[PDB]
Amino acid sequence: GNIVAANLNESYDINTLRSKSPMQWDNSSNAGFSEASNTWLPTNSDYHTV
Ligand SMILES: *[C@@H]1O[C@H](CO)[C@@H](O[C@@H]2O[C@H](CO)[C@@H](O)[C@H](O)[C@H]2NC(C)=O)[C@H](O)[C@H]1NC(C)=O
């Protein structure tokens, strides 16, 4: 699903950022997309079940 449009300090379209959230693999931190602390966009909150 979509995310809620967060604050980005790069020039992005806030109307269409909702479809660009990181891919949801396994239920790790950042849904297995990254082992970094913070990603460039927030992972959707339903990643534990989806
Ligand atoms: C844009 O990036 C962040 C938010 O996306 C801005 O705020 C910093 O966020 C980091 C993340 O934890 C904090 O540690 C800093 O204290 C924040 N404040 C700063 C750096 O003043 C950040 O200010 C923005 N960077 C720009 C505009 O260059």
What resolution in Å is listed for this PDB structure? 2.3
Cβ(32)–Cβ(16) under 8 Å? no
| 36 CB-near residues (< 8 Å, 6+ apart) | 30
- Candidate from 7, 8, 9, 39 with most ligand 1 atoms within 8 A of CB, to mutate: 9
Chain-centroid distance of CA 36 in Å reads 13
Distance (Å, whole) CA 11 – CA 28? 29
For the chain, the distance separating the N- and C-terminal CA atoms, rounded to the nearest angstrom, is 10
* Pocket of ligand 1 contains residue 37 by CB under 6 Å: no
**Is the shortest distance between the CB of 9 and ligand 1 below 6 Å?**
yes
Residue 33 φ then ψ, to 5°: -75, -35
Cα(25)–Cα(12) distance, rounded to whole angstroms? Answer: 25
The alpha carbon of 29 and the centre of ligand 1 are apart by a number of angstroms equal to 21
